[PDB]
């Protein structure tokens, strides 16, 4: 698994849309709640993500939001290879349910769940969080 | 420290730009928000802390930071509250503004350009490489 590969996926909750980007090699995630899976929101999500991390390749579910010209033009501007149809929503929903009663709004609880996921030590006390893994995988010097 | 950030706001076309700068690297995160409110501030900070190791954020004096929701977000996330990379962002947004209809988009292009731009000749690093290098070194 190359360090520049992300998987993008969507999850629906309380009638709202959660776009999730998973850095495949570390398990690190980024997520936003969006009003609906349109091309403008997808392009915007991908542009932000690509500005924050080295994004070489995105694997998608090939939803209609990805075939939109807006999103193709975003990947092109940002130098992203878009790979439609190339194959933890359950995990993120579980964690959202554990913080859900501390947030007045879903979107807040989503960011709380992201924080928790990315900080969680994976595989024992000597292991590493997703956050530690991504920076270790990506640091070049 | 790897964990020190500075947050500032920029006003433009009647929208507000919240800019967080990672002080040791120059790396930026930015969002356009309809208005500089306590709720938008809290959400911005919560997103930042889930994405990078945020220990301390230095802020301007303003009321958005006094909010009880900001205080709750900070307490939950372990954040303690206490220019060159800023007017540079505004210059970049200018250079690319015509490439996009909405300000939001131009802002995110400019954050992309800033964080990927090699400083110096062959041998140089971008702000994005500095931050990951600083933080990986610290682990
Ligand atoms: O410019 C707002 C822009 O950001 C999105 C998510 O991609 O909205 C989320 O992030 C904003 C910035 O912090 C918040 O203001 C917003 O409340 C939050 O859902 C976009 O949907 C939106 O167009
Ligand atoms: N090359 C490289 C390494 C890390 C990072 C970037 C580039 S970035 O600037 O895109 C953000 C983090």
mmCIF file of C-alpha atoms and ligand atoms in Angstrom:
data_model
loop_
_atom_site.group_PDB
_atom_site.id
_atom_site.type_symbol
_atom_site.label_atom_id
_atom_site.label_comp_id
_atom_site.label_asym_id
_atom_site.label_seq_id
_atom_site.Cartn_x
_atom_site.Cartn_y
_atom_site.Cartn_z
ATOM 1 C CA UNK A 1 0.000 0.000 0.000
ATOM 2 C CA UNK A 2 1.579 3.328 -1.242
ATOM 3 C CA UNK A 3 1.617 6.236 1.265
ATOM 4 C CA UNK A 4 -0.504 8.476 -1.114
ATOM 5 C CA UNK A 5 -3.557 6.250 -1.384
ATOM 6 C CA UNK A 6 -6.819 7.189 0.277
ATOM 7 C CA UNK A 7 -10.181 5.413 0.317
ATOM 8 C CA UNK A 8 -13.266 7.675 0.265
ATOM 9 C CA UNK A 9 -16.652 6.486 1.456
ATOM 10 C CA UNK A 10 -19.835 7.801 2.863
ATOM 11 C CA UNK A 11 -21.947 7.012 5.728
ATOM 12 C CA UNK A 12 -25.474 8.150 6.478
ATOM 13 C CA UNK A 13 -26.816 8.878 9.948
ATOM 14 C CA UNK A 14 -29.771 10.792 11.358
ATOM 15 C CA UNK A 15 -30.605 11.605 7.701
ATOM 16 C CA UNK A 16 -27.301 13.424 7.292
ATOM 17 C CA UNK A 17 -24.217 12.616 5.062
ATOM 18 C CA UNK A 18 -20.739 11.776 6.478
ATOM 19 C CA UNK A 19 -17.933 11.737 3.910
ATOM 20 C CA UNK A 20 -14.924 9.713 5.296
ATOM 21 C CA UNK A 21 -11.363 9.602 3.760
ATOM 22 C CA UNK A 22 -9.248 6.659 5.145
ATOM 23 C CA UNK A 23 -5.505 6.753 4.544
ATOM 24 C CA UNK A 24 -5.323 3.024 3.573
ATOM 25 C CA UNK A 25 -1.882 2.272 5.012
ATOM 26 C CA UNK A 26 -2.266 3.820 8.535
ATOM 27 C CA UNK A 27 -6.075 3.753 9.124
ATOM 28 C CA UNK A 28 -5.995 7.502 9.752
ATOM 29 C CA UNK A 29 -9.269 9.258 9.008
ATOM 30 C CA UNK A 30 -10.658 12.618 8.018
ATOM 31 C CA UNK A 31 -14.411 13.231 7.889
ATOM 32 C CA UNK A 32 -17.020 16.023 7.480
ATOM 33 C CA UNK A 33 -20.780 16.099 7.676
ATOM 34 C CA UNK A 34 -22.211 17.448 4.474
ATOM 35 C CA UNK A 35 -25.787 18.367 3.548
ATOM 36 C CA UNK A 36 -25.856 15.865 0.608
ATOM 37 C CA UNK A 37 -23.430 13.990 -1.690
ATOM 38 C CA UNK A 38 -23.220 16.544 -4.482
ATOM 39 C CA UNK A 39 -20.263 17.123 -6.847
ATOM 40 C CA UNK A 40 -19.567 20.630 -5.398
ATOM 41 C CA UNK A 41 -19.317 19.171 -1.749
ATOM 42 C CA UNK A 42 -17.239 16.168 -2.878
ATOM 43 C CA UNK A 43 -14.815 18.379 -4.856
ATOM 44 C CA UNK A 44 -14.529 20.695 -1.927
ATOM 45 C CA UNK A 45 -13.855 17.833 0.487
ATOM 46 C CA UNK A 46 -11.167 16.439 -1.806
ATOM 47 C CA UNK A 47 -9.511 19.762 -2.385
ATOM 48 C CA UNK A 48 -9.176 20.370 1.427
ATOM 49 C CA UNK A 49 -7.843 16.908 2.047
ATOM 50 C CA UNK A 50 -5.329 17.166 -0.783
ATOM 51 C CA UNK A 51 -4.105 20.543 0.685
ATOM 52 C CA UNK A 52 -3.539 18.934 4.112
ATOM 53 C CA UNK A 53 -1.831 15.699 3.164
ATOM 54 C CA UNK A 54 -0.050 14.217 0.148
ATOM 55 C CA UNK A 55 -2.874 12.752 -1.838
ATOM 56 C CA UNK A 56 -1.705 10.760 -4.902
ATOM 57 C CA UNK A 57 -4.596 8.338 -5.446
ATOM 58 C CA UNK A 58 -8.258 8.146 -4.298
ATOM 59 C CA UNK A 59 -10.200 4.975 -4.410
ATOM 60 C CA UNK A 60 -13.991 5.620 -4.619
ATOM 61 C CA UNK A 61 -17.245 3.767 -4.438
ATOM 62 C CA UNK A 62 -18.018 5.271 -7.937
ATOM 63 C CA UNK A 63 -21.152 7.152 -6.690
ATOM 64 C CA UNK A 64 -22.646 9.772 -8.884
ATOM 65 C CA UNK A 65 -20.840 12.458 -6.929
ATOM 66 C CA UNK A 66 -17.542 11.154 -8.327
ATOM 67 C CA UNK A 67 -18.546 11.066 -11.990
ATOM 68 C CA UNK A 68 -19.432 14.724 -11.733
ATOM 69 C CA UNK A 69 -17.305 17.066 -13.839
ATOM 70 C CA UNK A 70 -16.675 19.261 -10.721
ATOM 71 C CA UNK A 71 -14.906 16.424 -8.917
ATOM 72 C CA UNK A 72 -12.881 15.337 -11.989
ATOM 73 C CA UNK A 73 -11.727 18.944 -12.353
ATOM 74 C CA UNK A 74 -10.754 19.057 -8.637
ATOM 75 C CA UNK A 75 -8.640 15.878 -8.889
ATOM 76 C CA UNK A 76 -6.962 17.267 -12.009
ATOM 77 C CA UNK A 77 -6.133 20.613 -10.461
ATOM 78 C CA UNK A 78 -4.729 18.831 -7.422
ATOM 79 C CA UNK A 79 -2.883 16.051 -9.269
ATOM 80 C CA UNK A 80 -4.987 13.216 -7.790
ATOM 81 C CA UNK A 81 -5.505 9.997 -9.658
ATOM 82 C CA UNK A 82 -9.091 9.125 -9.217
ATOM 83 C CA UNK A 83 -9.797 5.367 -9.179
ATOM 84 C CA UNK A 84 -13.522 4.657 -9.244
ATOM 85 C CA UNK A 85 -14.868 1.225 -8.236
ATOM 86 C CA UNK A 86 -11.655 -0.114 -6.611
ATOM 87 C CA UNK A 87 -12.613 -1.956 -3.301
ATOM 88 C CA UNK A 88 -14.707 1.017 9.043
ATOM 89 C CA UNK A 89 -17.975 2.950 8.658
ATOM 90 C CA UNK A 90 -19.067 0.440 11.342
ATOM 91 C CA UNK A 91 -16.248 1.508 13.663
ATOM 92 C CA UNK A 92 -16.862 5.235 13.203
ATOM 93 C CA UNK A 93 -20.661 4.765 13.896
ATOM 94 C CA UNK A 94 -19.858 2.866 17.077
ATOM 95 C CA UNK A 95 -17.625 5.640 18.386
ATOM 96 C CA UNK A 96 -20.104 8.371 17.316
ATOM 97 C CA UNK A 97 -22.687 6.511 19.532
ATOM 98 C CA UNK A 98 -20.319 6.660 22.495
ATOM 99 C CA UNK A 99 -19.943 10.479 22.302
ATOM 100 C CA UNK A 100 -23.297 11.274 20.797
ATOM 101 C CA UNK A 101 -24.873 12.404 24.102
ATOM 102 C CA UNK A 102 -22.076 14.989 24.649
ATOM 103 C CA UNK A 103 -22.767 17.020 21.504
ATOM 104 C CA UNK A 104 -25.795 19.056 20.740
ATOM 105 C CA UNK A 105 -25.272 18.367 16.976
ATOM 106 C CA UNK A 106 -24.230 15.322 14.931
ATOM 107 C CA UNK A 107 -21.396 17.136 13.211
ATOM 108 C CA UNK A 108 -19.745 17.769 16.543
ATOM 109 C CA UNK A 109 -20.022 14.190 17.573
ATOM 110 C CA UNK A 110 -18.502 13.118 14.236
ATOM 111 C CA UNK A 111 -15.379 15.235 14.907
ATOM 112 C CA UNK A 112 -15.175 13.804 18.410
ATOM 113 C CA UNK A 113 -15.295 10.301 16.930
ATOM 114 C CA UNK A 114 -12.578 11.206 14.376
ATOM 115 C CA UNK A 115 -10.324 12.488 17.292
ATOM 116 C CA UNK A 116 -10.944 9.307 19.229
ATOM 117 C CA UNK A 117 -10.262 7.024 16.297
ATOM 118 C CA UNK A 118 -7.056 8.756 15.248
ATOM 119 C CA UNK A 119 -5.652 8.753 18.812
ATOM 120 C CA UNK A 120 -6.482 5.214 19.731
ATOM 121 C CA UNK A 121 -3.466 2.966 20.293
ATOM 122 C CA UNK A 122 -3.906 -0.006 18.042
ATOM 123 C CA UNK A 123 -2.468 -3.398 18.950
ATOM 124 C CA UNK A 124 -1.302 -3.091 22.581
ATOM 125 C CA UNK A 125 0.485 -0.675 24.895
ATOM 126 C CA UNK A 126 3.669 -0.713 22.753
ATOM 127 C CA UNK A 127 1.622 -0.076 19.550
ATOM 128 C CA UNK A 128 0.815 3.135 17.696
ATOM 129 C CA UNK A 129 -2.229 5.307 16.906
ATOM 130 C CA UNK A 130 -3.428 5.941 13.291
ATOM 131 C CA UNK A 131 -2.102 9.535 13.781
ATOM 132 C CA UNK A 132 1.357 8.263 14.684
ATOM 133 C CA UNK A 133 1.289 5.738 11.784
ATOM 134 C CA UNK A 134 0.388 8.226 9.078
ATOM 135 C CA UNK A 135 3.146 10.657 9.968
ATOM 136 C CA UNK A 136 5.695 7.842 10.294
ATOM 137 C CA UNK A 137 4.664 6.451 6.884
ATOM 138 C CA UNK A 138 4.743 9.839 5.174
ATOM 139 C CA UNK A 139 7.773 11.596 6.718
ATOM 140 C CA UNK A 140 10.591 11.599 4.170
ATOM 141 C CA UNK A 141 13.326 13.172 6.280
ATOM 142 C CA UNK B 1 6.992 22.246 20.496
ATOM 143 C CA UNK B 2 5.387 20.002 17.857
ATOM 144 C CA UNK B 3 2.010 20.962 19.492
ATOM 145 C CA UNK B 4 1.890 24.760 19.189
ATOM 146 C CA UNK B 5 -0.509 26.539 16.804
ATOM 147 C CA UNK B 6 -1.595 30.044 16.177
ATOM 148 C CA UNK B 7 -5.093 30.918 15.078
ATOM 149 C CA UNK B 8 -6.081 34.148 13.331
ATOM 150 C CA UNK B 9 -9.075 35.420 11.361
ATOM 151 C CA UNK B 10 -9.178 37.191 8.022
ATOM 152 C CA UNK B 11 -12.026 39.136 6.683
ATOM 153 C CA UNK B 12 -12.800 39.112 3.029
ATOM 154 C CA UNK B 13 -15.850 39.500 0.778
ATOM 155 C CA UNK B 14 -17.997 39.609 3.914
ATOM 156 C CA UNK B 15 -17.010 36.063 4.940
ATOM 157 C CA UNK B 16 -14.485 35.105 7.614
ATOM 158 C CA UNK B 17 -11.373 32.957 7.099
ATOM 159 C CA UNK B 18 -10.103 31.065 10.171
ATOM 160 C CA UNK B 19 -6.405 30.236 9.688
ATOM 161 C CA UNK B 20 -4.471 27.904 11.965
ATOM 162 C CA UNK B 21 -0.700 28.001 11.563
ATOM 163 C CA UNK B 22 1.546 25.305 12.994
ATOM 164 C CA UNK B 23 4.194 27.507 14.334
ATOM 165 C CA UNK B 24 7.337 25.360 13.950
ATOM 166 C CA UNK B 25 6.584 24.400 10.288
ATOM 167 C CA UNK B 26 4.378 27.133 8.697
ATOM 168 C CA UNK B 27 1.899 24.542 7.701
ATOM 169 C CA UNK B 28 -1.689 25.906 7.506
ATOM 170 C CA UNK B 29 -5.217 24.801 8.020
ATOM 171 C CA UNK B 30 -8.030 27.164 6.990
ATOM 172 C CA UNK B 31 -11.847 27.169 6.660
ATOM 173 C CA UNK B 32 -14.294 29.794 5.385
ATOM 174 C CA UNK B 33 -17.170 30.215 7.878
ATOM 175 C CA UNK B 34 -20.232 32.417 7.484
ATOM 176 C CA UNK B 35 -19.450 34.330 10.670
ATOM 177 C CA UNK B 36 -16.804 34.252 13.402
ATOM 178 C CA UNK B 37 -19.016 32.630 16.034
ATOM 179 C CA UNK B 38 -18.176 30.609 19.183
ATOM 180 C CA UNK B 39 -19.821 27.518 17.597
ATOM 181 C CA UNK B 40 -17.660 27.806 14.405
ATOM 182 C CA UNK B 41 -14.524 28.381 16.388
ATOM 183 C CA UNK B 42 -15.249 25.285 18.585
ATOM 184 C CA UNK B 43 -15.942 23.081 15.606
ATOM 185 C CA UNK B 44 -12.740 24.392 13.821
ATOM 186 C CA UNK B 45 -10.609 23.577 16.896
ATOM 187 C CA UNK B 46 -12.149 20.177 17.435
ATOM 188 C CA UNK B 47 -11.446 19.261 13.751
ATOM 189 C CA UNK B 48 -7.838 20.524 14.050
ATOM 190 C CA UNK B 49 -7.135 18.529 17.262
ATOM 191 C CA UNK B 50 -8.511 15.270 15.817
ATOM 192 C CA UNK B 51 -6.156 15.739 12.810
ATOM 193 C CA UNK B 52 -2.808 16.838 14.424
ATOM 194 C CA UNK B 53 -1.402 16.815 17.966
ATOM 195 C CA UNK B 54 -2.653 20.112 19.309
ATOM 196 C CA UNK B 55 -1.362 21.091 22.729
ATOM 197 C CA UNK B 56 -1.556 24.857 22.787
ATOM 198 C CA UNK B 57 -3.332 27.377 20.572
ATOM 199 C CA UNK B 58 -2.384 31.080 20.624
ATOM 200 C CA UNK B 59 -5.288 33.305 19.647
ATOM 201 C CA UNK B 60 -6.206 37.025 19.272
ATOM 202 C CA UNK B 61 -8.177 38.341 22.264
ATOM 203 C CA UNK B 62 -11.681 37.906 20.769
ATOM 204 C CA UNK B 63 -15.042 36.831 22.098
ATOM 205 C CA UNK B 64 -15.309 33.712 20.029
ATOM 206 C CA UNK B 65 -12.662 32.183 22.266
ATOM 207 C CA UNK B 66 -14.405 32.994 25.481
ATOM 208 C CA UNK B 67 -17.507 31.010 24.536
ATOM 209 C CA UNK B 68 -18.518 28.178 26.823
ATOM 210 C CA UNK B 69 -18.747 25.840 23.822
ATOM 211 C CA UNK B 70 -15.101 26.756 22.880
ATOM 212 C CA UNK B 71 -14.117 26.042 26.496
ATOM 213 C CA UNK B 72 -15.906 22.736 26.490
ATOM 214 C CA UNK B 73 -14.226 21.752 23.144
ATOM 215 C CA UNK B 74 -10.828 22.672 24.411
ATOM 216 C CA UNK B 75 -11.310 20.868 27.688
ATOM 217 C CA UNK B 76 -12.539 17.661 25.888
ATOM 218 C CA UNK B 77 -9.624 17.823 23.393
ATOM 219 C CA UNK B 78 -6.813 18.732 25.822
ATOM 220 C CA UNK B 79 -6.130 22.067 24.113
ATOM 221 C CA UNK B 80 -4.777 24.891 26.209
ATOM 222 C CA UNK B 81 -5.595 28.473 25.050
ATOM 223 C CA UNK B 82 -2.994 31.252 25.448
ATOM 224 C CA UNK B 83 1.716 37.015 10.108
ATOM 225 C CA UNK B 84 4.345 36.325 7.459
ATOM 226 C CA UNK B 85 2.575 32.920 6.854
ATOM 227 C CA UNK B 86 -0.767 34.867 7.174
ATOM 228 C CA UNK B 87 -0.558 37.757 4.642
ATOM 229 C CA UNK B 88 1.196 35.200 2.391
ATOM 230 C CA UNK B 89 -2.068 33.202 2.380
ATOM 231 C CA UNK B 90 -3.949 36.392 1.374
ATOM 232 C CA UNK B 91 -1.421 36.996 -1.465
ATOM 233 C CA UNK B 92 -1.903 33.431 -2.746
ATOM 234 C CA UNK B 93 -5.722 33.670 -2.591
ATOM 235 C CA UNK B 94 -5.301 36.777 -4.856
ATOM 236 C CA UNK B 95 -3.059 34.961 -7.367
ATOM 237 C CA UNK B 96 -5.686 32.154 -7.807
ATOM 238 C CA UNK B 97 -9.012 33.908 -7.126
ATOM 239 C CA UNK B 98 -10.051 33.975 -10.835
ATOM 240 C CA UNK B 99 -9.633 30.166 -11.094
ATOM 241 C CA UNK B 100 -12.769 29.585 -8.991
ATOM 242 C CA UNK B 101 -16.268 31.034 -8.476
ATOM 243 C CA UNK B 102 -16.518 30.817 -4.688
ATOM 244 C CA UNK B 103 -14.089 32.258 -2.225
ATOM 245 C CA UNK B 104 -14.159 28.922 -0.238
ATOM 246 C CA UNK B 105 -12.572 27.176 -3.220
ATOM 247 C CA UNK B 106 -9.874 29.811 -3.763
ATOM 248 C CA UNK B 107 -9.051 29.575 -0.056
ATOM 249 C CA UNK B 108 -8.541 25.862 -0.257
ATOM 250 C CA UNK B 109 -6.431 26.144 -3.452
ATOM 251 C CA UNK B 110 -4.206 28.626 -1.618
ATOM 252 C CA UNK B 111 -3.787 26.335 1.429
ATOM 253 C CA UNK B 112 -2.904 23.567 -1.057
ATOM 254 C CA UNK B 113 -0.363 25.818 -2.830
ATOM 255 C CA UNK B 114 1.172 27.028 0.520
ATOM 256 C CA UNK B 115 1.560 23.638 2.154
ATOM 257 C CA UNK B 116 3.104 21.960 -0.995
ATOM 258 C CA UNK B 117 5.450 24.729 -2.015
ATOM 259 C CA UNK B 118 9.110 23.876 -1.665
ATOM 260 C CA UNK B 119 10.999 26.665 -0.005
ATOM 261 C CA UNK B 120 14.574 27.171 -1.288
ATOM 262 C CA UNK B 121 16.423 25.288 -4.072
ATOM 263 C CA UNK B 122 17.017 21.547 -4.472
ATOM 264 C CA UNK B 123 17.545 20.521 -0.814
ATOM 265 C CA UNK B 124 14.411 22.480 0.260
ATOM 266 C CA UNK B 125 11.208 21.270 2.087
ATOM 267 C CA UNK B 126 7.587 22.389 1.948
ATOM 268 C CA UNK B 127 5.586 23.367 5.099
ATOM 269 C CA UNK B 128 3.740 20.015 4.755
ATOM 270 C CA UNK B 129 7.009 18.100 4.803
ATOM 271 C CA UNK B 130 8.265 20.152 7.788
ATOM 272 C CA UNK B 131 5.220 19.369 9.957
ATOM 273 C CA UNK B 132 5.236 15.622 9.293
ATOM 274 C CA UNK B 133 9.010 15.591 9.824
ATOM 275 C CA UNK B 134 8.876 17.515 13.112
ATOM 276 C CA UNK B 135 6.059 15.305 14.440
ATOM 277 C CA UNK B 136 7.489 11.947 13.277
ATOM 278 C CA UNK B 137 10.827 12.939 14.833
ATOM 279 C CA UNK B 138 9.112 13.596 18.162
ATOM 280 C CA UNK B 139 7.257 10.247 18.336
HETATM 281 O O1 LIG C 1 -17.052 26.288 4.070
HETATM 282 C C1 LIG C 1 -17.914 25.389 4.752
HETATM 283 C C2 LIG C 1 -17.683 24.048 4.106
HETATM 284 O O2 LIG C 1 -17.094 23.032 5.001
HETATM 285 C C3 LIG C 1 -17.991 21.910 5.072
HETATM 286 C C4 LIG C 1 -17.419 20.465 5.067
HETATM 287 O O3 LIG C 1 -16.640 20.059 3.879
HETATM 288 O O4 LIG C 1 -18.693 22.223 6.292
HETATM 289 C C5 LIG C 1 -18.107 21.787 7.549
HETATM 290 O O5 LIG C 1 -16.929 22.555 7.882
HETATM 291 C C6 LIG C 1 -17.146 23.968 7.973
HETATM 292 C C7 LIG C 1 -15.859 24.704 8.348
HETATM 293 O O6 LIG C 1 -15.312 24.525 9.677
HETATM 294 C C8 LIG C 1 -18.277 24.245 8.965
HETATM 295 O O7 LIG C 1 -18.613 25.614 8.919
HETATM 296 C C9 LIG C 1 -19.534 23.415 8.668
HETATM 297 O O8 LIG C 1 -20.480 23.692 9.690
HETATM 298 C C10 LIG C 1 -19.152 21.952 8.634
HETATM 299 O O9 LIG C 1 -20.275 21.079 8.407
HETATM 300 C C11 LIG C 1 -18.820 22.106 3.780
HETATM 301 O O10 LIG C 1 -20.040 21.408 3.678
HETATM 302 C C12 LIG C 1 -19.048 23.576 3.705
HETATM 303 O O11 LIG C 1 -19.465 24.022 2.407
HETATM 304 N N1 LIG C 2 5.840 15.346 0.343
HETATM 305 C C1 LIG C 2 4.981 15.605 1.374
HETATM 306 C C2 LIG C 2 5.066 14.985 2.624
HETATM 307 C C3 LIG C 2 4.128 15.318 3.637
HETATM 308 C C4 LIG C 2 3.103 16.277 3.447
HETATM 309 C C5 LIG C 2 3.052 16.876 2.129
HETATM 310 C C6 LIG C 2 3.980 16.543 1.147
HETATM 311 S S1 LIG C 2 1.849 17.915 2.062
HETATM 312 O O1 LIG C 2 2.340 19.264 1.884
HETATM 313 O O2 LIG C 2 1.045 17.712 0.916
HETATM 314 C C7 LIG C 2 1.209 17.716 3.589
HETATM 315 C C8 LIG C 2 2.012 16.787 4.298
#
